[PDB]
DNA sequence: ATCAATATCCACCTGCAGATACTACCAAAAGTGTATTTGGAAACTGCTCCATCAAAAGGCATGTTCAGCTGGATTCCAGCTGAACATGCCTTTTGATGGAGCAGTTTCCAAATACACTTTTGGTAGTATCTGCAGGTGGATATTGAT
DNA sequence: ATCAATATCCACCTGCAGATACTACCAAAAGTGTATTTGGAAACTGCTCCATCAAAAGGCATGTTCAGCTGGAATCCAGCTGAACATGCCTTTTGATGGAGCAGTTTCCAAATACACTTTTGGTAGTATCTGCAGGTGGATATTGAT
């Protein structure tokens, strides 16, 4: 009796949802607190400008976004609706993020 | 003390907003974009000018170099377009004076 | 009475800024009078270009006021300015609706 | 004083968050060892954009990391944005 | 019965024949006819520099050789030996030379 | 005979350039997408380059031309000058 | 009268470095030690370059080096190979390399 | 007529240190030639770059450096850095 | 296993293209020295905004259960693509030969820089009042999935 | 097909963040005018090297046959992954506060540019000798594929 979307239902009405929006995806204090830990190993006692974290932010969205994208291509290449780990190496290597 | 001046292309662009769009505004974000947008282009199309110059060693940039740039740099229909345009605004100013 | 060198040149674009940020941006050792006007209405004109099509996807989203959104809409849309800043990143732009069809249910 | 230590923060950006990127990607499927994969593609991304920025930094004799330098570090991977000063 | 290699034994002979060597692979003459061709669809009446139309050559012929590469893993990816026009268009399309 | 430009850069030189990229079998297909390909890269190449001959008011193409064209396009080509 | 070359210790031509930092629209002013640094970075890459590339020639018994050897050198060093990623040696070939599912039996 | 200019006569000096009995031929010659030229615009550049955000109109060792540790791989930096140090030491020494 | 057909490798040899060593000539370039100028470090310090704290709360992460349907494995076979070989077409070679046009030199003027002075303007700041649209609600329509 | 559960749509609303408005103010920007300097266009010309020509010669492209084996289709099923739920943590939001450190102003000298003059050197052009290695040989042996 319980109502269930079928597997895979959900997910495209989450494509069409996040395809629609511009809001950032990641939780903004933990990636903050990301940045902060990466920076510090490179450097100790490193203030931030609130305005750089979030260009940070931004920026890795954007990245992951676009790789997420190629990655989709790799996947339905190999006649896959499922993405991978072998997808994101084959869209980095071309890329020439690794090659 | 007084904060020093930042310069902007805002009431510039803000000016052709209302020549295309008279009852359109625009978010101080999305002005934030057309800033980058022109000193990017505006930068990129110099440094192209100046890499031509010094290929012919020329030590001057003239409106000849912004051309080659503008045509090296824009895609199709955006060069020509561009090049109508600042052909057109470098001679109307040279009519002048 | 003294003439703006963008009213001389019948532009909006500063001539002016344009020629000192030339100047002093160390790109050359002399620029020529006509160089700051050219750019100037070229920069003018990409302005002009954009902010046409970035009304109109506000339009379309029944919005009087243009957003970043409205701008990546534009230039993504756009087969001309999406190559000129096809290596551009808009902040709070966000991305082309597109699903891969072969994702689609049958 | 001083904070706490700050480590594993790799693991906020949880599972959750990552299907959200995916799919503003257009993922509709994803295999279980893609969230370990996604974090350290991620890793390496920022650290090489902090390690430049870090650099900009430095060079002014800063102490503070400010979105030009971010900017700028970004500008020169290859990696443009605007709407921070650019 | 006469002498055969079986299929892939020569082809595999000729990659490592071909990639211990670095000559230039597309004849001279027909290479530069193609380049005036083109060039002539810009500009007539032009003329070359023999070292401008090698230049061309190596830069192509390098072009080429680095996209066979990335086309090859992409159908390796989709479990095949054999390439296809959709690799090279997969190859292009993340590589950012196309849509 | 009465053949393309295009159509001189034969079969079997294609064939090569895919041994040397590691290719071990090819379709049959992949002759005429690798044309297009091929001259796709020319067009925009030789466009900068002749560019760039024209700036200079020459009638003649350089090797410098070529090569300033290959960097701007990310081609950045070593052994030809600059 | 001394080099300023000599007086650094180096093969490559600080004076001339110089002269081009200046003709090079870099900047308004060149300081007197960064045509040094720099000549000095370009004469170690290149040293670096041509270790890589004798010992590629020796290896392939030869005395003379030539761009199939710089390509050797470079693709097959880490960080050169990164440095130079989008750059094509001409006449330098590719890396033997077969991929291994290509491989028989 | 005229003189072109190169690196030749300082890449086969170099040469020469690191491999005495070793030689290079021209079309080698011009590869290097191309290597160091590239490399000097990639520097000068984002030392240009430095100068400019930083509001300064001069380049100085310290602009070469940033750029170098910009420019380079990890180990490639640490030794380039080390020699540009050591030659600006050297010469003002001197 | 054997065995034959080719490919591949090693040692040696020799012609020559391209590398070397030589003298000599010379403009440009690099060094030296002096006089002048100024970029930007140092000092001091106003004042923005960054780190941090508290405190409440609900949006959202976590962990679990369940089973739909995906990925991976297997089998199968039609047909495409590799290998081999027979033709013969056209690329390659090279060597001479006009002559296009790149490039060097001289001339000289429109257009550049430099500078003194005057006017104009865009940026900031200070408050003070509109206004587009985010987000909440309710209710009608659309979509999906079970039967 | 029917029908029910749920998402989606759209109209309507209200609060307010953020956009707009206006005056004051001012340093820097920008323009005008005059004097002085010079980049590079223009015309002419020498000499590099590009286009074209003939002319074999054989290397390599093309067409054809035959079949090995690859790609793709079809079928099965174990279990991964998506959907839904319960639970409650920790991100978000709001606001305050100290004070780090960024940034603004002014001072002042080590190091920059600018010439003039002198010395050196890299690029050059002939001219002559030299040599690393491509390419050809033979003959050993490794590889491949048929039994
Ligand atoms: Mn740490
Ligand atoms: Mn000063
Ligand atoms: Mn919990
Ligand atoms: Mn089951
Ligand atoms: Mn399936
Ligand atoms: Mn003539
Ligand atoms: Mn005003
Ligand atoms: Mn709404
Ligand atoms: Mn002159
Ligand atoms: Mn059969
Ligand atoms: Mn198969
Ligand atoms: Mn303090
Ligand atoms: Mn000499
Ligand atoms: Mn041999």
Sequence with gaps: KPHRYRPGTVALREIRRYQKSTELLIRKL???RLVREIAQDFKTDLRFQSSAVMALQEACEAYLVGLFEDTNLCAIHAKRVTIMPKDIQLARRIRGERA | RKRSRKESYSIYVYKVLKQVHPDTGISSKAMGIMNSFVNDIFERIAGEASRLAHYNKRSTITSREIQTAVRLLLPGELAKHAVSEGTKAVTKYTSAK | KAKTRSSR??????????????????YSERVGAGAPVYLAAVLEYL??????????????????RIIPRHLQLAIRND???????????????????????????? | RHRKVLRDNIQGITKPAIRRLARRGGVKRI?????????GVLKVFLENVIRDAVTYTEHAKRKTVTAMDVVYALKRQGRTLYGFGG
Tied chains: 1, 5.
């Design chain 1, 30 to 32: 933990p990636f903050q």
């Design chain 3, 9 to 26: 040149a019948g532009l909006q674009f500063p001539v002016g800024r344009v020629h000192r940020l030339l100047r002093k941006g160390n």
């Design chain 3, 47 to 64: 302005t002009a270009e954009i902010l046409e099509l970035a009304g109109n996807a506000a339009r379309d989203n029944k919005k009087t």
């Design chain 3, 79 to 106: 087969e001309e300015l999406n190559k000129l800043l096809g290596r551009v990143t808009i902040a709070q732009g966000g991305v082309l609706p597109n699903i891969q069809a072969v994702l689609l249910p049958k």
């Design chain 4, 31 to 39: 295999s279980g060892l893609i969230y370990e994969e996604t974090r």
